Paper text:
The structure was solved by the molecular replacement method and refined against X-ray data extending to 1.8 Å resolution as described in Experimental procedures. There are two molecules (A and B) in the asymmetric unit of the PfTrx-Px2 crystals. Each PfTrx-Px2 chain contains five α-helices and nine β-strands arranged as a seven-stranded β-sheet and a pair of strands connected by a short turn. Embedded within the structure is a thioredoxin fold encompassing strands β4-β3-β8-β9 of the β-sheet and three of the flanking helices, these being α1, α2, α4 and α5. In the dimer, the seven-stranded β-sheets from each subunit come together to form an extended 14-stranded β-sheet, with the apposed β9 strands in antiparallel orientation. Analysis of the PfTrx-Px2 crystal structure clearly reveals that the protein is in the oxidized state. There is an intermolecular disulphide bond between the peroxidatic cysteine, Cys67 of chain A and the resolving cysteine, Cys187 of chain B. This is mirrored by a corresponding disulphide bond between Cys67 of chain B and Cys187 of chain A. It is known that oxidation of other peroxiredoxins is accompanied by conformational changes in the protein in the form of local unwinding of the Cp helix containing the peroxidatic cysteine, Cys67 and a reorganization of the C-terminus. The electron density maps around Cys187 from the B chain indicate the presence of two alternate positions of the sulphur atom, giving rise to a double conformation of the disulphide bond that may be a manifestation of the mobility necessary for the C-terminal cysteine to resolve the peroxidatic cysteine during the reaction mechanism. There is a conserved glutamic acid residue, Glu70, near to and buried by the disulphide bridge. Its side-chain makes ionic interactions with arginines 142 and 165.
Author numbering:
A (entry chain B): 21 to 195
B (entry chain A): 21 to 188
The structure:
Amino acid sequence: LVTKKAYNFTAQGLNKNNEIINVDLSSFIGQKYCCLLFYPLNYTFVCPTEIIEFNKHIKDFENKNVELLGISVDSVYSHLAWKNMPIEKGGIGNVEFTLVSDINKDISKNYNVLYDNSFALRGLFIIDKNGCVRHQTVNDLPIGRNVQEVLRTIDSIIHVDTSGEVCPINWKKGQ
Amino acid sequence: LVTKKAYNFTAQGLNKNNEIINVDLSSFIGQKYCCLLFYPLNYTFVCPTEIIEFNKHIKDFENKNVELLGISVDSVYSHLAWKNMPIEKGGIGNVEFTLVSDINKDISKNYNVLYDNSFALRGLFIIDKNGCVRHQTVNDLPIGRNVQEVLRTIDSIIHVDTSGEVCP
């Protein structure tokens, strides 16, 4: 997937104002980077803590001109219920980014993260302003993502885009 | 590939004593975790510093019972030449882990990291002691990997194996 053109999905999403919107990946072309964050909502593997942590740092994504999109196979109702649920009860609160409903499973399939025709694995992708996939990580299902690591990854991609440098040497940065 | 059994391969490798050996991935099952570090040796994208940094942390991999395997499409000669090349000329030095030669491209193909049927992308996989793929990352070609991040990932996998905690 990395180096190739990202699968351009169209799906319903629930935005930061809890409005149902049509989310079209191609709308961000020439405008914004995207970070696609896939996750499961089954009780065995659900991880509200990682979503809460991404939301805590949402302005860091905004500062970097990155649209964060959470994606799962579950319905718009299911996402709204998760946002409305108390944190103490396993909820995520009213997070400030869009949650996308992959209800036909084609988004997870086309990002190679659909498990058993059932749910999305813990996948993460960074999409650049040309619509190209620039990073792919699939974490072990029980392990949440580290938002600081994701933001550093994004930083490196932005650096490549602005400088064209391959592998830059750390000590020499200044010079 | 994550959650599925790793593609087993048998390939030539150049070990830490610069001997050419047989590298059979299935030989580590029940014995050690493996970290498969794919990389390009292509002039445009070659990144010696990332290999050097992983080598500097080889005692951490050993302490975690992880076999680190560098994999590229290039010959054993190329790997030996790269090890012998001075650092200031783009060499990696005599690294203390095995470099595997994926000459026929089958390993890169089966791990979905072959670019333009030519060279390997910057893929990394962690395989557990049962031979299951537990983590997969593919970095942008111009961007080297961060070994400290890899080591934290391995720590998390080992913690799951020993504790069974979801989302600790």
